[PDB]
Amino acid sequence: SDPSSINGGIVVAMTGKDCVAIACDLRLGSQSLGVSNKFEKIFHYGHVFLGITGLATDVTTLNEMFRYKTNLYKLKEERAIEPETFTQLVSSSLYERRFGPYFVGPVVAGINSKSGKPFIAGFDLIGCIDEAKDFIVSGTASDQLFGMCESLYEPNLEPEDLFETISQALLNAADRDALSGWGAVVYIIKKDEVVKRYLKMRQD
Amino acid sequence: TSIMAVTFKDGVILGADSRTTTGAYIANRVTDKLTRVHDKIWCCRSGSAADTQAIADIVQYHLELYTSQYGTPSTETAASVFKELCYENKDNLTAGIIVAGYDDKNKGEVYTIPLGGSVHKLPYAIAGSGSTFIYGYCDKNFRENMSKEETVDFIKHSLSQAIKWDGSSGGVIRMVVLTAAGVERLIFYPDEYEQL
Amino acid sequence: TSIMAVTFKDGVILGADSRTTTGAYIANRVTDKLTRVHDKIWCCRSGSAADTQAIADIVQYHLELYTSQYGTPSTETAASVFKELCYENKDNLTAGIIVAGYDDKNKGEVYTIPLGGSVHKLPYAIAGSGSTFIYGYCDKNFRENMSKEETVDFIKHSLSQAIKWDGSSGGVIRMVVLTAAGVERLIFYPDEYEQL
Amino acid sequence: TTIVGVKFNNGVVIAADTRSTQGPIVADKNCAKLHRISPKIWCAGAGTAADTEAVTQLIGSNIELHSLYTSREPRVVSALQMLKQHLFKYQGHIGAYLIVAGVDPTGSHLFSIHAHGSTDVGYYLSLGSGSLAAMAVLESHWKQDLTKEEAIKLASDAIQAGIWNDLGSGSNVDVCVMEIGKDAEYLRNYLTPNVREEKQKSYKFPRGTTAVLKESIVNICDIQEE
Amino acid sequence: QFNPYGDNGGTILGIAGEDFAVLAGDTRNITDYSINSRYEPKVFDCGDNIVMSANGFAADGDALVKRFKNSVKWYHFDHNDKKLSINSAARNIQHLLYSRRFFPYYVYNIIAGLDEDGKGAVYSFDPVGSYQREQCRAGGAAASLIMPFLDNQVNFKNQYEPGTNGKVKKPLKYLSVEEVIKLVRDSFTSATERHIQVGDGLEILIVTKDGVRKEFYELKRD
Amino acid sequence: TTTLAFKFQHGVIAAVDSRASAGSYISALRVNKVIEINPYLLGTMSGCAADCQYWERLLAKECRLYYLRNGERISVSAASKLLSNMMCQYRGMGLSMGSMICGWDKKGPGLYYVDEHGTRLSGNMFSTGSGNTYAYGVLDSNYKWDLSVEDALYLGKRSILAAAHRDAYSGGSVNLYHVTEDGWIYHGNHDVGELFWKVKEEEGSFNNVIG
Amino acid sequence: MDIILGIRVQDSVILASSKAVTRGISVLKDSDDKTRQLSPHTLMSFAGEAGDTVQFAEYIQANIQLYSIREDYELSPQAVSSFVRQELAKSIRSRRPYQVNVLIGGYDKKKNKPELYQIDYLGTKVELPYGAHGYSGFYTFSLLDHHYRPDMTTEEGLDLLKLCVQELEKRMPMDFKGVIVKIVDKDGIRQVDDF
Amino acid sequence: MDIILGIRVQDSVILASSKAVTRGISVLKDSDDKTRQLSPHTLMSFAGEAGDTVQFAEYIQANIQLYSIREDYELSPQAVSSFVRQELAKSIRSRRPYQVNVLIGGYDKKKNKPELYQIDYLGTKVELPYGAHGYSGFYTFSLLDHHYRPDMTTEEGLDLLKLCVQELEKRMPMDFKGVIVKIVDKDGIRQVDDF
Amino acid sequence: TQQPIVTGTSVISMKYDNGVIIAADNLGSYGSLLRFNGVERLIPVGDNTVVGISGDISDMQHIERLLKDLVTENAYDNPLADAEEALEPSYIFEYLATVMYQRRSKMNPLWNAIIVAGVQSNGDQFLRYVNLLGVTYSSPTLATGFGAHMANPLLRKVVDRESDIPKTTVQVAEEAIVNAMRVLYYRDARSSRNFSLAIIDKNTGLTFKKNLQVENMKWDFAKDIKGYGTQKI
């Protein structure tokens, strides 16, 4: 019944030293039934990454919508959108449906191409921005992720160390959530190279 | 309903209207809400008529049996019996009772027992749906150790206003005077009290 | 809330308490419930603060525009604008307003507008949750053509009792005097009115 | 949340805590509740977080356009009127409870405003879940003719009462001082009484601890030449 | 309508070592958004080298502990001062809880001590009496925050040995009391940051063959 | 949960998962959903954990008393019936308990399904819990009476795996039991995480999943 | 309606759909075809609330047929599935949503690949090797997880499908009156008349 | 449970009862016997809420068996049916009523007549030539009204019963997994193993 | 199950170096009506304990009688009733807490919140809370109802933790309590100006103060406040 927990799923993002990381599980379900183990929840518009949890139809719909808006932004501005600007666009777009909202928990991650500064942000289903320095969590195992991130995280981690920390935060949180799991992906993001890794996890 | 009990120099006086309603229909316009539980211990009844009658009948039985064994009961004792019934059966009752009595030792005493079953000893008390409209008037005009005639006028004026504003109150004003001299019943008709 | 407006020889006086509650919490203890819609036309507000503020702001706009075109509006005209808003939007409002004003031709006038949106012109009016406790007192003590000092004492004593018994009422007593001489604001603190 | 507003000699000061909640969970530990409507008009918000931000930005946008149209500096009564009429129209569904304060050519002002559209004037005000803890402090220590330094102290003390005693409030204290004839000074993290102690252990993992299936480079660049 | 239940918050944590056991819990007591007490003990020494904590609705928690302590007393009287083993205590508590199957003790219960072979033992209960022996268990408000951290840092879940790439797991080496207390303190510090009902103080009870020892640590009071 | 049990040539197989839920939160990774009532009787558990434990441990009390009075082991039919009669006393009171009573007695191997309604069914194959539908699919297509003990143990193991994969409220680990006329035999605890990958490679199944 | 299954094999997509239609306590029809051809190489099966199913299907059919005539070109299965998803995602926030779940089986002539898309009434799209709607997956997915390979022939796909229907017929309480099976491949759409 | 039928012919009573038992969305058993022998020449079939059915049936069985031993005599079908009705009429005003509908088929050895009694959970008893509980009668009674004679043989009764089951299998949405048929005559009770 | 009719509001208390202080106003409210103005809600038990009660007044009067009967019963066959075997605050509290929890377990609660304040035989301070649910807790400061929200924050500025108790004098503690009662009068709509205050000291014994009033109130600033926004007159 609760739209935010029908399909299940989680997203987490972290900052490091001159880098960011964003990760998600791959499950899509109909309550107890697992339907897909390839439902990726992370999208990118240029060098800006967006993770979305919640109702899968709205996840899909919002991706198509932000692709639409960022493609027009680029044609008019003659440049790719930055994370700080995109964050405001997400907030604007969500609040315009204040009384009929998308049931989602978006997460923005990226590096400003000009300043080189790492950036992450989280939102509620209505647009309130949570701009954190350390990490952002979203999904059905958000409580679990908060406990993992808050104890495992330390600032100024190097990309290859940050990978291990975010991966373990996701994996162990997902293993205490019935509605999350069935695979996982981690994006490691630097100013001009991005690596994507699929994790091996238990498939129950 | 509009009921009150007031202590004064020589004892205590109970007062009440005479209207009983079933919604907006006046089922009885000459009701006697001043009921005797002992020779010089009376009560004013408000709330469910069935409940308050049943209680007062039981109390009258208890005080009759008390008297047979231990002699004349105090007004405090009567109020305790009322309380014990109202408090222990609070889930199934809707009764707001004022108890008033005269001793020679304690003179005039007034106890009020609202819905919950708590007891409150007071110089004077007001209760019923019509009491709300005269809290200000009664507080401003009440004095301790009034005369009989002053106290009658105080109750008459007070209930006159309660009747004026409350639709659930009306009819005649009945009063019962409790002193060493005995027990006096009074009655005041609309043509008298409406022109006040 | 406890509010009232009283006509007298030289004009009219509005009075109010200063308590605003959110349940049992006093959100504001120094509220100004006496609000100006025109130079010498004021209103007392009761009910939803949001609703009564929105209304009074709209009325003030209507009377400002009336004045620009047709000159100074009557107190009856102001009450009609209040009524029109309260009556036509009765399903979405919870507003009980007393309107009071001074003309040189009509002198002091008082109109009350209860929940439904009906209008009632009166010598004096009381409203708010605390008004219930002083219906008896005010009826007994009000006289027509009182002096300014008598009228101030009448309102002071009346609201004193309303505050005494009503928990939703309290704080200071504010008053606004409307005469030919002008507009006078008065204030009375607890230490003054509590000992009455 | 806990938010307060305090008037003083030559101006007005507002303050707020920095905790944001999703039920019993803390979403943000260093949230910013002090919003700018105009340069010298700031408001603090409690209730639905998105609503306090959105309604503040909207009115702030319209106030800026108004200021440009009239060639005048914006007034607090304008922001107040625009806010209450907007909130009233939505009949409480926009859950924004705000303390609005500022200085303008008329002087210094302090108002509170509820979600249903009712406004309120005062020398000292408090809103939010910790408003009672804060108001207890304000009622104990407030006086007439406060200095700037006394008012900042009173304001932050009132927020601390909320931080310590209210579970819906916590972390740091934000302040904004608006004095007449001066620029408004926004004191972000004026107090920091809730720094986390050092952890007993480091949970940095050995590289290669996590099991991986596939790796791939992600093309973020545009389509290339040649 | 009268609601006989309430929520007093709090969080508890039990960890079993090789020859020891710990039972920790925060000392904060709350209703809604108010703090009742910053120091209200929640973990108790029940005798016979057994420690216990009933987290959730304080009134039901105090009643259960009180009854179990009483059950220990009568076990001595009836069975010639015999020591109540941890496994026997656990089973007894199941029956105490199921007595109210249709008006439950609204609490999550953990006990800790040593088994009859001297090894560390932790037992966990739901409100209606299902119990299990466990190596690790967090209960209460921030249980979902802490348990995943313990799966990772106590049982080395999802952790493998570098160079093998997922082929060989991290071996399950035992933890010392000093290492466990570090994980306990970091668990509660992290829980205090992100959970509003957790804070003020942390009280740990450590059980060994020598007896029951206490340790107290401050937590953030916001 | 997912539980199953089936009769065959060489007794009865019983397999269960190990997950426990508290809504979406996985409260336990490794709970024991089988009770060793006696050396020749087993009981599976599905539903309210407290009810399953209390009533089946009470059943074990009643089965032991039967042995002392009659000097003879209780039948599977009689044991299942005692349990179903307990359920009928608390009929409508809100118990939640689904269980299979597996064992070997004089009539040979025995298997009974019992639930909180007082239902008592004799049969060759049963599966209970949230993930029973997935288990039935594998069982129905591969079951024979002519199964070897080695193949039968694998079938029950593989059937739980199927359910653990698809059902969100099933998983953790697999517990196997084999009941003979010399008594039941525990055949270990098997982690689903490790078992899934092992089965995927060896069997070739779960092609859709990437590993 | 009740059960709709789908499986994508090496060189084709196979859709199986129940034949039953029930009004009240009576089965009105036992030969109902719960499918519509959207284009020569694209087939859509459907299941949901009475009336809405056919309406929606025919509305989609008309739109795709209109596109085909206008451009003289067949849309890819992916393109059609995205159009269908948008129409459902548009529908879920309408005054009265269309309560329809669909499977879209198509053969992409450009890529020479079969494709199966599962879309529910909310507009939740997923590409799958095999899929189902409602309770059908609860019984069948365990068999498909075990037996499915991507290099299966059409004949092997039909045999695995028979096993799925047999399991449904054993463990489902409802009698769905068998299934109509249709195959979608490079040569187009055809019906298996004996099943 | 679901479907229970009964028909009284010339010299016997025939009871047909479904084999299915369902828990949740899964059919647990397809060979369940929804009947109990009360005495050598009296059979009772039953259908209703889970658990209550068997409990009630076994409780009745125990009472009739106790009577048989005490008096060394078999109660008439009429007497047994009246005892059963009273137990149900007693039950309907209890704290928690037994939600069970029954058919009682018996052969009266004194009168040399077959007898069929239909009793619902309220304690509503009726003697009939043919009967059913639940929705079963909605489909079958029209056939029985048309084809039934009182001088029918047991074989003709079985053929008419087959026609009733075929109609149920065509028009009922639920799969009840066929029926177990039992015959009650002068020689006692026997089961038709092929149907 | 019932509903409270005539009610008493906040009871506030705190520990200081040599004892405890407890206070409560003298009002008995009937919903929004301030019906009864002479109600004592602090009830002494012996010369070493004061029980402060909020909530339903009829249930308070019932508890008042249980305590009076407890004293009577303790004196029975007890030569040391006024010495070693006198009633202790901990005895009185545990009795009440047993009663409160039993009543809630029968779904017929005493609709109250109680604070038992006193000094034990060994001079130790006793301060513990119990309510209609049988929930119990102890703290250096305790308060019921509105007092929990407004008084505790002020009293915790004086005694924030256990180590602050020996540093707190009776003059400072009384001052803090009296200030808190003033704040509650400003802000609690079901409160009164008149209140009672009790001090239980280990040296000077029980001091029971009646007919106290809230004084030194700030209202003058109200004259300057006009309208609700734009109004100037």
Ligand SMILES: *[C@@](C)(CO)[C@](*)(O)[C@H](Cc1ccccc1)NC(=O)[C@H](Cc1c[nH]c2ccccc12)NC(=O)[C@@H](C)NC(=O)CN1CCOCC1
């Ligand atoms: C205190 C923490 C108490 O809430 C403050 O008022 C704080 C105010 C604030 C203002 C600006 C930025 C950050 C914080 N409020 C919140 O943090 C607020 C608490 C909250 C949660 N649900 C509420 C419903 C009604 C009123 C307050 C509520 N947080 C939020 O609003 C954030 C976390 N958003 C949500 O929780 C999402 N909600 C959107 C509307 O639909 C319900 C869910």
Ligand SMILES: *[C@@](C)(CO)[C@](*)(O)[C@H](Cc1ccccc1)NC(=O)[C@H](Cc1c[nH]c2ccccc12)NC(=O)[C@@H](C)NC(=O)CN1CCOCC1
């Ligand atoms: C699936 C996992 C269903 O979710 C199983 O049926 C499982 C069965 C089971 C049986 C015996 C022991 C453990 C588990 N059931 C549960 O896990 C059960 C599901 C559940 C939750 N609420 C229910 C209400 C009615 C019926 C079932 C319900 N969960 C529980 O019982 C939860 C509430 N209890 C525990 O997790 C208790 N833990 C205490 C410490 O020991 C481990 C169990």
Ligand SMILES: [Mg+2]
């Ligand atoms: Mg699973």
Ligand SMILES: [Mg+2]
């Ligand atoms: Mg009248």
Ligand SMILES: [Mg+2]
């Ligand atoms: Mg706090």
Ligand SMILES: [Mg+2]
């Ligand atoms: Mg019938």
